[PDB]
């Protein structure tokens, strides 16, 4: 069960969402970033982007209220994560996912350093991109941000860091 403080890391961002990993670190899917971030000129931030995974490091502490959590490069295969989806209506929609393997993918012409998974009635929509994939290890670990799903809904992909 994900607690409110965890949910509160999920933040409306561009055409999708992002996740406050720590008071200074925000992660999201590259193709939702618009073309200032939370009232910071672009020169303020350490932006690292690769494979549809964007990470922002801010200068000032943007979410002092959070404890920093562990950002892993994906998760061990087979693992079950929760996808912490917020809808524009405010509904919280935690989706459980059995994580397949990490792999380079080409999805609608973009290179995704991603990890696939199977759902476990509900599925992802456009607008859900950037929502975090998480599991608890006395910790909560974030291993990905939502990037794609198949025309169906069975399989979803999250972009992972390198
Ligand atoms: C967030 O910006 C979206 C997430 C949309 C989602 O999760 N479900 C929407 C269901 C409708 N739908 C759109 C597509 N598929 N279904 C387009 C595309 N999917 C696809 O090409 O097949 C999946 C796949 C997986 C592995 C290998 C080949 C193909 C898709 O999801 N595109 C992304 C954007 C890309 C990554 C630039 C997308 O729409 N994300």
JSON list of C-alpha atoms and ligand atoms in Angstrom, two decimals:
[
{"chain": "A", "resi": 1, "resn": "UNK", "atom": "CA", "xyz": [0.00, 0.00, 0.00]},
{"chain": "A", "resi": 2, "resn": "UNK", "atom": "CA", "xyz": [1.46, 3.33, -1.07]},
{"chain": "A", "resi": 3, "resn": "UNK", "atom": "CA", "xyz": [1.13, 6.08, 1.57]},
{"chain": "A", "resi": 4, "resn": "UNK", "atom": "CA", "xyz": [0.01, 9.68, 0.90]},
{"chain": "A", "resi": 5, "resn": "UNK", "atom": "CA", "xyz": [3.53, 11.09, 1.14]},
{"chain": "A", "resi": 6, "resn": "UNK", "atom": "CA", "xyz": [4.59, 8.68, -1.62]},
{"chain": "A", "resi": 7, "resn": "UNK", "atom": "CA", "xyz": [1.61, 9.62, -3.81]},
{"chain": "A", "resi": 8, "resn": "UNK", "atom": "CA", "xyz": [2.53, 13.27, -3.20]},
{"chain": "A", "resi": 9, "resn": "UNK", "atom": "CA", "xyz": [5.79, 12.73, -5.07]},
{"chain": "A", "resi": 10, "resn": "UNK", "atom": "CA", "xyz": [3.73, 12.23, -8.26]},
{"chain": "A", "resi": 11, "resn": "UNK", "atom": "CA", "xyz": [3.45, 15.66, -9.88]},
{"chain": "A", "resi": 12, "resn": "UNK", "atom": "CA", "xyz": [1.66, 17.00, -12.95]},
{"chain": "A", "resi": 13, "resn": "UNK", "atom": "CA", "xyz": [4.35, 17.83, -15.48]},
{"chain": "A", "resi": 14, "resn": "UNK", "atom": "CA", "xyz": [4.16, 18.92, -19.11]},
{"chain": "A", "resi": 15, "resn": "UNK", "atom": "CA", "xyz": [2.01, 16.51, -21.07]},
{"chain": "A", "resi": 16, "resn": "UNK", "atom": "CA", "xyz": [2.35, 13.92, -18.29]},
{"chain": "A", "resi": 17, "resn": "UNK", "atom": "CA", "xyz": [3.75, 13.36, -14.81]},
{"chain": "A", "resi": 18, "resn": "UNK", "atom": "CA", "xyz": [6.98, 13.21, -12.86]},
{"chain": "A", "resi": 19, "resn": "UNK", "atom": "CA", "xyz": [8.18, 11.91, -9.52]},
{"chain": "A", "resi": 20, "resn": "UNK", "atom": "CA", "xyz": [10.08, 13.70, -6.76]},
{"chain": "A", "resi": 21, "resn": "UNK", "atom": "CA", "xyz": [12.80, 11.18, -5.89]},
{"chain": "A", "resi": 22, "resn": "UNK", "atom": "CA", "xyz": [14.21, 13.44, -3.19]},
{"chain": "A", "resi": 23, "resn": "UNK", "atom": "CA", "xyz": [13.87, 17.12, -2.18]},
{"chain": "A", "resi": 24, "resn": "UNK", "atom": "CA", "xyz": [16.08, 18.03, -5.17]},
{"chain": "A", "resi": 25, "resn": "UNK", "atom": "CA", "xyz": [15.69, 15.20, -7.72]},
{"chain": "A", "resi": 26, "resn": "UNK", "atom": "CA", "xyz": [12.72, 15.03, -10.13]},
{"chain": "A", "resi": 27, "resn": "UNK", "atom": "CA", "xyz": [12.44, 12.27, -12.78]},
{"chain": "A", "resi": 28, "resn": "UNK", "atom": "CA", "xyz": [10.09, 11.96, -15.77]},
{"chain": "A", "resi": 29, "resn": "UNK", "atom": "CA", "xyz": [9.73, 10.60, -19.30]},
{"chain": "A", "resi": 30, "resn": "UNK", "atom": "CA", "xyz": [11.62, 12.64, -21.88]},
{"chain": "A", "resi": 31, "resn": "UNK", "atom": "CA", "xyz": [8.74, 13.01, -24.32]},
{"chain": "A", "resi": 32, "resn": "UNK", "atom": "CA", "xyz": [6.41, 14.72, -21.77]},
{"chain": "A", "resi": 33, "resn": "UNK", "atom": "CA", "xyz": [8.88, 17.53, -20.96]},
{"chain": "A", "resi": 34, "resn": "UNK", "atom": "CA", "xyz": [7.60, 20.76, -22.56]},
{"chain": "A", "resi": 35, "resn": "UNK", "atom": "CA", "xyz": [9.71, 23.10, -24.69]},
{"chain": "A", "resi": 36, "resn": "UNK", "atom": "CA", "xyz": [11.40, 27.48, -16.53]},
{"chain": "A", "resi": 37, "resn": "UNK", "atom": "CA", "xyz": [10.78, 24.41, -14.32]},
{"chain": "A", "resi": 38, "resn": "UNK", "atom": "CA", "xyz": [8.89, 24.92, -11.05]},
{"chain": "A", "resi": 39, "resn": "UNK", "atom": "CA", "xyz": [9.94, 28.56, -11.02]},
{"chain": "A", "resi": 40, "resn": "UNK", "atom": "CA", "xyz": [13.60, 27.94, -11.84]},
{"chain": "A", "resi": 41, "resn": "UNK", "atom": "CA", "xyz": [15.37, 29.27, -14.95]},
{"chain": "A", "resi": 42, "resn": "UNK", "atom": "CA", "xyz": [16.80, 26.49, -17.08]},
{"chain": "A", "resi": 43, "resn": "UNK", "atom": "CA", "xyz": [20.37, 27.38, -16.05]},
{"chain": "A", "resi": 44, "resn": "UNK", "atom": "CA", "xyz": [19.57, 26.32, -12.47]},
{"chain": "A", "resi": 45, "resn": "UNK", "atom": "CA", "xyz": [19.20, 22.60, -13.10]},
{"chain": "A", "resi": 46, "resn": "UNK", "atom": "CA", "xyz": [21.48, 19.63, -13.83]},
{"chain": "A", "resi": 47, "resn": "UNK", "atom": "CA", "xyz": [19.53, 17.94, -16.65]},
{"chain": "A", "resi": 48, "resn": "UNK", "atom": "CA", "xyz": [20.56, 14.38, -17.58]},
{"chain": "A", "resi": 49, "resn": "UNK", "atom": "CA", "xyz": [18.54, 12.69, -20.33]},
{"chain": "A", "resi": 50, "resn": "UNK", "atom": "CA", "xyz": [18.97, 9.38, -22.15]},
{"chain": "A", "resi": 51, "resn": "UNK", "atom": "CA", "xyz": [16.63, 6.75, -23.58]},
{"chain": "A", "resi": 52, "resn": "UNK", "atom": "CA", "xyz": [13.41, 8.64, -22.67]},
{"chain": "A", "resi": 53, "resn": "UNK", "atom": "CA", "xyz": [14.46, 8.88, -18.99]},
{"chain": "A", "resi": 54, "resn": "UNK", "atom": "CA", "xyz": [14.96, 12.49, -17.86]},
{"chain": "A", "resi": 55, "resn": "UNK", "atom": "CA", "xyz": [16.46, 13.44, -14.48]},
{"chain": "A", "resi": 56, "resn": "UNK", "atom": "CA", "xyz": [16.49, 16.99, -13.09]},
{"chain": "A", "resi": 57, "resn": "UNK", "atom": "CA", "xyz": [18.82, 18.00, -10.27]},
{"chain": "A", "resi": 58, "resn": "UNK", "atom": "CA", "xyz": [17.76, 21.33, -8.80]},
{"chain": "A", "resi": 59, "resn": "UNK", "atom": "CA", "xyz": [19.90, 23.90, -6.99]},
{"chain": "A", "resi": 60, "resn": "UNK", "atom": "CA", "xyz": [17.46, 24.76, -4.19]},
{"chain": "A", "resi": 61, "resn": "UNK", "atom": "CA", "xyz": [15.47, 22.19, -2.23]},
{"chain": "A", "resi": 62, "resn": "UNK", "atom": "CA", "xyz": [12.14, 22.01, -4.06]},
{"chain": "A", "resi": 63, "resn": "UNK", "atom": "CA", "xyz": [10.33, 19.48, -1.83]},
{"chain": "A", "resi": 64, "resn": "UNK", "atom": "CA", "xyz": [11.95, 19.81, 1.63]},
{"chain": "A", "resi": 65, "resn": "UNK", "atom": "CA", "xyz": [9.19, 17.61, 3.07]},
{"chain": "A", "resi": 66, "resn": "UNK", "atom": "CA", "xyz": [10.37, 14.35, 1.47]},
{"chain": "A", "resi": 67, "resn": "UNK", "atom": "CA", "xyz": [12.98, 11.82, 2.48]},
{"chain": "A", "resi": 68, "resn": "UNK", "atom": "CA", "xyz": [15.17, 10.90, -0.49]},
{"chain": "A", "resi": 69, "resn": "UNK", "atom": "CA", "xyz": [14.52, 7.38, -1.77]},
{"chain": "A", "resi": 70, "resn": "UNK", "atom": "CA", "xyz": [16.56, 4.91, -3.81]},
{"chain": "A", "resi": 71, "resn": "UNK", "atom": "CA", "xyz": [16.50, 5.28, -7.60]},
{"chain": "A", "resi": 72, "resn": "UNK", "atom": "CA", "xyz": [17.63, 1.97, -9.15]},
{"chain": "A", "resi": 73, "resn": "UNK", "atom": "CA", "xyz": [18.40, 1.25, -12.81]},
{"chain": "A", "resi": 74, "resn": "UNK", "atom": "CA", "xyz": [15.29, -0.86, -13.26]},
{"chain": "A", "resi": 75, "resn": "UNK", "atom": "CA", "xyz": [14.39, -3.71, -10.96]},
{"chain": "A", "resi": 76, "resn": "UNK", "atom": "CA", "xyz": [15.22, -7.44, -10.89]},
{"chain": "A", "resi": 77, "resn": "UNK", "atom": "CA", "xyz": [13.11, -9.27, -13.46]},
{"chain": "A", "resi": 78, "resn": "UNK", "atom": "CA", "xyz": [9.93, -11.01, -12.33]},
{"chain": "A", "resi": 79, "resn": "UNK", "atom": "CA", "xyz": [9.52, -8.37, -9.60]},
{"chain": "A", "resi": 80, "resn": "UNK", "atom": "CA", "xyz": [6.08, -6.87, -9.00]},
{"chain": "A", "resi": 81, "resn": "UNK", "atom": "CA", "xyz": [5.97, -3.06, -8.93]},
{"chain": "A", "resi": 82, "resn": "UNK", "atom": "CA", "xyz": [3.12, -0.62, -8.52]},
{"chain": "A", "resi": 83, "resn": "UNK", "atom": "CA", "xyz": [2.61, 2.07, -11.14]},
{"chain": "A", "resi": 84, "resn": "UNK", "atom": "CA", "xyz": [1.48, 5.18, -9.26]},
{"chain": "A", "resi": 85, "resn": "UNK", "atom": "CA", "xyz": [-0.90, 6.74, -11.76]},
{"chain": "A", "resi": 86, "resn": "UNK", "atom": "CA", "xyz": [-2.62, 10.05, -11.04]},
{"chain": "A", "resi": 87, "resn": "UNK", "atom": "CA", "xyz": [-5.39, 11.09, -13.42]},
{"chain": "A", "resi": 88, "resn": "UNK", "atom": "CA", "xyz": [-6.17, 14.71, -14.29]},
{"chain": "A", "resi": 89, "resn": "UNK", "atom": "CA", "xyz": [-9.38, 14.21, -12.27]},
{"chain": "A", "resi": 90, "resn": "UNK", "atom": "CA", "xyz": [-7.41, 13.56, -9.06]},
{"chain": "A", "resi": 91, "resn": "UNK", "atom": "CA", "xyz": [-8.13, 9.83, -8.98]},
{"chain": "A", "resi": 92, "resn": "UNK", "atom": "CA", "xyz": [-5.24, 7.70, -7.73]},
{"chain": "A", "resi": 93, "resn": "UNK", "atom": "CA", "xyz": [-4.83, 4.47, -9.70]},
{"chain": "A", "resi": 94, "resn": "UNK", "atom": "CA", "xyz": [-2.16, 2.07, -8.39]},
{"chain": "A", "resi": 95, "resn": "UNK", "atom": "CA", "xyz": [-1.44, -0.59, -11.06]},
{"chain": "A", "resi": 96, "resn": "UNK", "atom": "CA", "xyz": [0.55, -3.71, -10.17]},
{"chain": "A", "resi": 97, "resn": "UNK", "atom": "CA", "xyz": [3.01, -4.91, -12.81]},
{"chain": "A", "resi": 98, "resn": "UNK", "atom": "CA", "xyz": [5.08, -8.09, -13.18]},
{"chain": "A", "resi": 99, "resn": "UNK", "atom": "CA", "xyz": [8.33, -6.75, -14.61]},
{"chain": "A", "resi": 100, "resn": "UNK", "atom": "CA", "xyz": [9.87, -8.59, -17.55]},
{"chain": "A", "resi": 101, "resn": "UNK", "atom": "CA", "xyz": [13.33, -7.73, -18.87]},
{"chain": "A", "resi": 102, "resn": "UNK", "atom": "CA", "xyz": [15.28, -4.55, -19.55]},
{"chain": "A", "resi": 103, "resn": "UNK", "atom": "CA", "xyz": [16.09, -3.86, -23.18]},
{"chain": "A", "resi": 104, "resn": "UNK", "atom": "CA", "xyz": [16.70, -1.19, -25.75]},
{"chain": "A", "resi": 105, "resn": "UNK", "atom": "CA", "xyz": [13.47, -0.54, -27.63]},
{"chain": "A", "resi": 106, "resn": "UNK", "atom": "CA", "xyz": [12.40, 1.61, -30.59]},
{"chain": "A", "resi": 107, "resn": "UNK", "atom": "CA", "xyz": [8.84, 2.77, -29.82]},
{"chain": "A", "resi": 108, "resn": "UNK", "atom": "CA", "xyz": [7.23, 5.04, -32.43]},
{"chain": "A", "resi": 109, "resn": "UNK", "atom": "CA", "xyz": [10.70, 5.99, -33.59]},
{"chain": "A", "resi": 110, "resn": "UNK", "atom": "CA", "xyz": [12.30, 6.82, -30.22]},
{"chain": "A", "resi": 111, "resn": "UNK", "atom": "CA", "xyz": [14.97, 4.80, -28.44]},
{"chain": "A", "resi": 112, "resn": "UNK", "atom": "CA", "xyz": [13.70, 3.66, -25.02]},
{"chain": "A", "resi": 113, "resn": "UNK", "atom": "CA", "xyz": [16.06, 2.17, -22.44]},
{"chain": "A", "resi": 114, "resn": "UNK", "atom": "CA", "xyz": [13.13, 0.41, -20.90]},
{"chain": "A", "resi": 115, "resn": "UNK", "atom": "CA", "xyz": [11.79, -2.55, -18.98]},
{"chain": "A", "resi": 116, "resn": "UNK", "atom": "CA", "xyz": [8.61, -4.33, -19.94]},
{"chain": "A", "resi": 117, "resn": "UNK", "atom": "CA", "xyz": [5.96, -5.74, -17.64]},
{"chain": "A", "resi": 118, "resn": "UNK", "atom": "CA", "xyz": [2.59, -7.44, -17.59]},
{"chain": "A", "resi": 119, "resn": "UNK", "atom": "CA", "xyz": [-0.39, -5.98, -15.76]},
{"chain": "A", "resi": 120, "resn": "UNK", "atom": "CA", "xyz": [-2.28, -7.82, -13.01]},
{"chain": "A", "resi": 121, "resn": "UNK", "atom": "CA", "xyz": [-9.56, -4.59, -15.96]},
{"chain": "A", "resi": 122, "resn": "UNK", "atom": "CA", "xyz": [-7.37, -1.45, -15.86]},
{"chain": "A", "resi": 123, "resn": "UNK", "atom": "CA", "xyz": [-4.65, 0.00, -18.03]},
{"chain": "A", "resi": 124, "resn": "UNK", "atom": "CA", "xyz": [-2.58, 3.03, -18.94]},
{"chain": "A", "resi": 125, "resn": "UNK", "atom": "CA", "xyz": [-3.71, 5.91, -21.14]},
{"chain": "A", "resi": 126, "resn": "UNK", "atom": "CA", "xyz": [-1.89, 8.71, -22.93]},
{"chain": "A", "resi": 127, "resn": "UNK", "atom": "CA", "xyz": [-1.34, 11.26, -20.20]},
{"chain": "A", "resi": 128, "resn": "UNK", "atom": "CA", "xyz": [-0.05, 8.62, -17.76]},
{"chain": "A", "resi": 129, "resn": "UNK", "atom": "CA", "xyz": [3.52, 8.97, -19.01]},
{"chain": "A", "resi": 130, "resn": "UNK", "atom": "CA", "xyz": [6.03, 9.89, -16.33]},
{"chain": "A", "resi": 131, "resn": "UNK", "atom": "CA", "xyz": [4.17, 8.02, -13.60]},
{"chain": "A", "resi": 132, "resn": "UNK", "atom": "CA", "xyz": [6.63, 6.09, -11.42]},
{"chain": "A", "resi": 133, "resn": "UNK", "atom": "CA", "xyz": [7.15, 2.36, -11.10]},
{"chain": "A", "resi": 134, "resn": "UNK", "atom": "CA", "xyz": [7.90, 1.55, -7.46]},
{"chain": "A", "resi": 135, "resn": "UNK", "atom": "CA", "xyz": [8.40, -1.32, -5.05]},
{"chain": "A", "resi": 136, "resn": "UNK", "atom": "CA", "xyz": [9.26, -1.47, -1.35]},
{"chain": "A", "resi": 137, "resn": "UNK", "atom": "CA", "xyz": [12.48, -3.16, -0.29]},
{"chain": "A", "resi": 138, "resn": "UNK", "atom": "CA", "xyz": [12.02, -0.79, 4.98]},
{"chain": "A", "resi": 139, "resn": "UNK", "atom": "CA", "xyz": [12.43, 1.26, 1.80]},
{"chain": "A", "resi": 140, "resn": "UNK", "atom": "CA", "xyz": [10.50, 2.33, -1.27]},
{"chain": "A", "resi": 141, "resn": "UNK", "atom": "CA", "xyz": [12.50, 2.08, -4.50]},
{"chain": "A", "resi": 142, "resn": "UNK", "atom": "CA", "xyz": [11.62, 3.76, -7.78]},
{"chain": "A", "resi": 143, "resn": "UNK", "atom": "CA", "xyz": [12.97, 1.93, -10.82]},
{"chain": "A", "resi": 144, "resn": "UNK", "atom": "CA", "xyz": [11.16, 3.54, -13.75]},
{"chain": "A", "resi": 145, "resn": "UNK", "atom": "CA", "xyz": [8.85, 6.11, -15.27]},
{"chain": "A", "resi": 146, "resn": "UNK", "atom": "CA", "xyz": [5.99, 5.20, -17.56]},
{"chain": "A", "resi": 147, "resn": "UNK", "atom": "CA", "xyz": [6.81, 5.49, -21.25]},
{"chain": "A", "resi": 148, "resn": "UNK", "atom": "CA", "xyz": [4.65, 3.21, -23.41]},
{"chain": "A", "resi": 149, "resn": "UNK", "atom": "CA", "xyz": [2.04, 0.48, -23.63]},
{"chain": "A", "resi": 150, "resn": "UNK", "atom": "CA", "xyz": [0.85, -1.74, -26.47]},
{"chain": "A", "resi": 151, "resn": "UNK", "atom": "CA", "xyz": [-2.21, -0.89, -28.58]},
{"chain": "A", "resi": 152, "resn": "UNK", "atom": "CA", "xyz": [-3.96, -3.32, -26.26]},
{"chain": "A", "resi": 153, "resn": "UNK", "atom": "CA", "xyz": [-3.00, -2.73, -22.65]},
{"chain": "A", "resi": 154, "resn": "UNK", "atom": "CA", "xyz": [-1.45, -6.02, -21.60]},
{"chain": "A", "resi": 155, "resn": "UNK", "atom": "CA", "xyz": [2.19, -4.90, -21.77]},
{"chain": "A", "resi": 156, "resn": "UNK", "atom": "CA", "xyz": [3.58, -1.61, -20.51]},
{"chain": "A", "resi": 157, "resn": "UNK", "atom": "CA", "xyz": [7.07, -0.16, -20.68]},
{"chain": "A", "resi": 158, "resn": "UNK", "atom": "CA", "xyz": [8.86, 2.08, -18.25]},
{"chain": "A", "resi": 159, "resn": "UNK", "atom": "CA", "xyz": [12.01, 3.97, -19.10]},
{"chain": "A", "resi": 160, "resn": "UNK", "atom": "CA", "xyz": [14.89, 3.31, -16.71]},
{"chain": "A", "resi": 161, "resn": "UNK", "atom": "CA", "xyz": [18.09, 5.15, -15.90]},
{"chain": "A", "resi": 162, "resn": "UNK", "atom": "CA", "xyz": [21.56, 3.99, -16.96]},
{"chain": "B", "resi": 1, "resn": "LIG", "atom": "C1", "xyz": [2.52, 8.38, -22.58]},
{"chain": "B", "resi": 1, "resn": "LIG", "atom": "O1", "xyz": [2.97, 9.49, -23.32]},
{"chain": "B", "resi": 1, "resn": "LIG", "atom": "C2", "xyz": [2.14, 7.28, -23.55]},
{"chain": "B", "resi": 1, "resn": "LIG", "atom": "C3", "xyz": [1.57, 6.08, -22.77]},
{"chain": "B", "resi": 1, "resn": "LIG", "atom": "C4", "xyz": [0.27, 5.53, -23.37]},
{"chain": "B", "resi": 1, "resn": "LIG", "atom": "C5", "xyz": [-0.21, 4.20, -22.71]},
{"chain": "B", "resi": 1, "resn": "LIG", "atom": "O2", "xyz": [0.40, 3.71, -21.82]},
{"chain": "B", "resi": 1, "resn": "LIG", "atom": "N1", "xyz": [-1.40, 3.52, -23.19]},
{"chain": "B", "resi": 1, "resn": "LIG", "atom": "C6", "xyz": [-2.17, 4.10, -24.29]},
{"chain": "B", "resi": 1, "resn": "LIG", "atom": "C7", "xyz": [-2.87, 3.01, -25.14]},
{"chain": "B", "resi": 1, "resn": "LIG", "atom": "C8", "xyz": [-2.97, 3.51, -26.55]},
{"chain": "B", "resi": 1, "resn": "LIG", "atom": "N2", "xyz": [-1.72, 3.21, -27.25]},
{"chain": "B", "resi": 1, "resn": "LIG", "atom": "C9", "xyz": [-0.83, 4.06, -27.82]},
{"chain": "B", "resi": 1, "resn": "LIG", "atom": "C10", "xyz": [0.29, 3.35, -28.42]},
{"chain": "B", "resi": 1, "resn": "LIG", "atom": "N3", "xyz": [-0.03, 2.10, -28.13]},
{"chain": "B", "resi": 1, "resn": "LIG", "atom": "N4", "xyz": [-1.19, 2.02, -27.45]},
{"chain": "B", "resi": 1, "resn": "LIG", "atom": "C11", "xyz": [1.54, 3.88, -29.17]},
{"chain": "B", "resi": 1, "resn": "LIG", "atom": "C12", "xyz": [2.86, 3.32, -28.67]},
{"chain": "B", "resi": 1, "resn": "LIG", "atom": "N5", "xyz": [2.78, 1.88, -28.42]},
{"chain": "B", "resi": 1, "resn": "LIG", "atom": "C13", "xyz": [3.57, 0.95, -29.29]},
{"chain": "B", "resi": 1, "resn": "LIG", "atom": "O3", "xyz": [4.17, 1.41, -30.21]},
{"chain": "B", "resi": 1, "resn": "LIG", "atom": "O4", "xyz": [3.63, -0.46, -29.04]},
{"chain": "B", "resi": 1, "resn": "LIG", "atom": "C14", "xyz": [4.26, -0.83, -27.82]},
{"chain": "B", "resi": 1, "resn": "LIG", "atom": "C15", "xyz": [5.63, -1.47, -28.15]},
{"chain": "B", "resi": 1, "resn": "LIG", "atom": "C16", "xyz": [6.40, -2.00, -27.12]},
{"chain": "B", "resi": 1, "resn": "LIG", "atom": "C17", "xyz": [7.64, -2.56, -27.41]},
{"chain": "B", "resi": 1, "resn": "LIG", "atom": "C18", "xyz": [8.11, -2.60, -28.73]},
{"chain": "B", "resi": 1, "resn": "LIG", "atom": "C19", "xyz": [7.34, -2.06, -29.75]},
{"chain": "B", "resi": 1, "resn": "LIG", "atom": "C20", "xyz": [6.10, -1.49, -29.46]},
{"chain": "B", "resi": 1, "resn": "LIG", "atom": "C21", "xyz": [3.28, 4.09, -27.41]},
{"chain": "B", "resi": 1, "resn": "LIG", "atom": "O5", "xyz": [3.02, 3.71, -26.31]},
{"chain": "B", "resi": 1, "resn": "LIG", "atom": "N6", "xyz": [4.04, 5.34, -27.62]},
{"chain": "B", "resi": 1, "resn": "LIG", "atom": "C22", "xyz": [4.48, 6.14, -26.48]},
{"chain": "B", "resi": 1, "resn": "LIG", "atom": "C23", "xyz": [5.32, 7.31, -26.94]},
{"chain": "B", "resi": 1, "resn": "LIG", "atom": "C24", "xyz": [6.68, 6.83, -27.56]},
{"chain": "B", "resi": 1, "resn": "LIG", "atom": "C25", "xyz": [7.56, 6.05, -26.60]},
{"chain": "B", "resi": 1, "resn": "LIG", "atom": "C26", "xyz": [7.44, 8.03, -28.12]},
{"chain": "B", "resi": 1, "resn": "LIG", "atom": "C27", "xyz": [3.22, 6.63, -25.75]},
{"chain": "B", "resi": 1, "resn": "LIG", "atom": "O6", "xyz": [2.20, 6.81, -26.34]},
{"chain": "B", "resi": 1, "resn": "LIG", "atom": "N7", "xyz": [3.32, 6.83, -24.30]}
]
